[PDB]
């Protein structure tokens, strides 16, 4: 007939965008509003569905600062599709653009926002569990949120507060390893149930990754994912914070604070933000959103 894919009543499905995916993320256009959007697709034939409740997690999250807006979730051919706000490049894309190292001022502007970003998620009774540069996106050139660091892909999320009992989820071990090894907390490596602290420790590893240019467990390979996971975990446990965070005292303080958090414990986000804003102010930095990537030329799918 038409040969054109539509999602819902007004969303035209466009070209495949981004790297990886394999057709899972497409540019889209709201024909009614003449606006571009991002469309996440998941084959209805999927063995491990995530789209629909990722959608639910977004519902649960609600309209929020740094949270992409979701417009639609519906069937599209042999695909379930979720239409949401089109954003810009990820911190990983920007990192490469900046030769794989961010200035402390850029990392602190990022860190201050993400601690708040994570606290927001946590305030909605959700733990993220998928921290990595690729899941943090700036907005787009003009849609006035380009300097806001956004958080995306809540497929690995989990409700850490039982909705009925209103109790924190129970501690337990033997959780299989799946997330990304490079940033995951040490306890995640130990097979322990993840909680608030783990999102915060993962952010710490990522902050040091940005500052150093790389992490010391980064090149570890093995004959089985499990083994690789185990080696990376061994090295994380074998690298002293003072060594990992050499030259960044605040980062070491942030890291061992979160590493020592109790499983059920509510992090003191104010305390962590202050470690960084005090530093920020002492260095003489001005929070003006002028990241290292400002002035460089960014990739735009449109």
Ligand X SMILES: COc1cnc(-c2cnc3ccccc3c2)nc1-c1cc2c([nH]1)CCNC2=O
CB of 180 to ligand X, least distance (A): 13
CB of 172 to ligand X, least distance (A): 27
Taking the CA atoms of residue 210, residue 219, residue 157 and residue 155 in that order, the dihedral angle to the nearest 10 degrees is 100
Contact 139, 85 (CB under 8 A): no
| Nearest to ligand X of 87, 148 (CB atom) | 87
Is 23 known to sit in a ligand binding site?
Answer: yes
> What gap in Å lies between CA 249 and CA 180, rounded to an integer?
26
Asked about 130 being catalytic, the answer comes back as yes
Is 169 known to sit in a ligand binding site?
Answer: no
**Under the phi-then-psi rule, with left for phi > 0, alpha for psi from -120 to 50, and beta for the rest, what region is 144?**
left
Taking each helix axis from N to C end, the angle separating 104-123 and 269-283, rounded to the nearest 10 degrees, works out to 160
> What gap in Å lies between CA 105 and CA 102, rounded to an integer?
8
Is 40 known to sit in a ligand binding site?
Answer: yes
| Nearest to ligand X of 77, 141 (CB atom) | 141
> What gap in Å lies between CA 68 and CA 135, rounded to an integer?
12
| Nearest to ligand X of 40, 197 (CB atom) | 40
Is 124 known to sit in a ligand binding site?
Answer: no
Is 76 known to sit in a ligand binding site?
Answer: no
**Residue (of 2, 23, 4, 3) closest to 13 by Cα position:** 4
> How many CB atoms neighbour CB 234 within 10 A?
14
Which residues are bridge partners to 26 per DSSP?
A: 16, 39
CB of 282 to ligand X, least distance (A): 35
Catalytic residue, chosen from 93, 96, 130, 270, is 130
Which positions touch ligand X (CB under 6 A)?
Answer: 17-18, 25, 38, 40, 68, 84-89, 137, 152-153, 299, 301
**Residue (of 184, 124, 187) closest to 159 by Cα position:** 124
CB of 159 to ligand X, least distance (A): 18
CB of 224 to ligand X, least distance (A): 26
Is 287 known to sit in a ligand binding site?
Answer: no
| Nearest to ligand X of 17, 97 (CB atom) | 17
| Nearest to ligand X of 40, 236 (CB atom) | 40
Known binding-site residue numbers:
17-25, 40
Give the residue numbers annotated as catalytic, written as ranges.
Answer: 130
Known binding-site residue numbers for ATP:
17-25, 40
């Amino acid at each position: 007939g038409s040969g054109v894919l539509m999602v819902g009543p007004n969303f035209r499905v466009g070209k495949k965008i981004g790297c990886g995916n394999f057709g899972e993320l497409r540019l889209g256009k709201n024909l009614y509003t003449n606006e571009y959007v991002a469309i996440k697709l998941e084959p209805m034939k999927s063995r491990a569905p995530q789209l629909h409740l990722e959608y639910r997690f977004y519902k649960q999250l609600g309209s929020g600062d740094g949270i992409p807006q979701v417009y639609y979730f519906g069937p599209c051919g042999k695909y379930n599709a979720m239409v949401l706000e089109l954003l810009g490049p990820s911190l990983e894309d920007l990192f490469d653009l900046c030769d794989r190292t961010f200035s402390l001022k850029t990392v602190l502007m990022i860190a201050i926002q993400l601690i708040s970003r994570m606290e927001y998620v946590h305030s909605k009774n959700l733990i993220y569990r998928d921290v990595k540069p690729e899941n943090f996106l700036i907005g787009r050139p003009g849609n006035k949120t380009q300097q806001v660091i956004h958080i995306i892909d809540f497929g690995l999320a989990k409700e850490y507060i039982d909705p009925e009992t209103k109790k924190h989820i129970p501690y337990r071990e033997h959780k299989s390893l799946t997330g990304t090894a490079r940033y995951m907390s040490i306890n995640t490596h130990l097979g322990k149930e993840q909680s608030r602290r783990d999102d915060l420790e993962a952010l710490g590893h990522m902050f040091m990754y940005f500052l150093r240019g790389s992490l010391p467990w980064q090149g570890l390979k093995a004959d089985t994912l499990k083994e690789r996971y185990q080696k990376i975990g061994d090295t994380k446990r074998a690298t002293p914070i003072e060594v990992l965070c050499e030259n960044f005292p605040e980062m070491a303080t942030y890291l061992r604070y979160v590493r020592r958090l109790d499983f059920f414990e509510k992090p003191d986000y104010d305390y962590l933000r202050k470690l960084f804003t005090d530093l920020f102010d002492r260095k003489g930095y001005m929070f003006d959103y002028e990241y290292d990537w400002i002035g460089k030329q960014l990739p735009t799918p449109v």
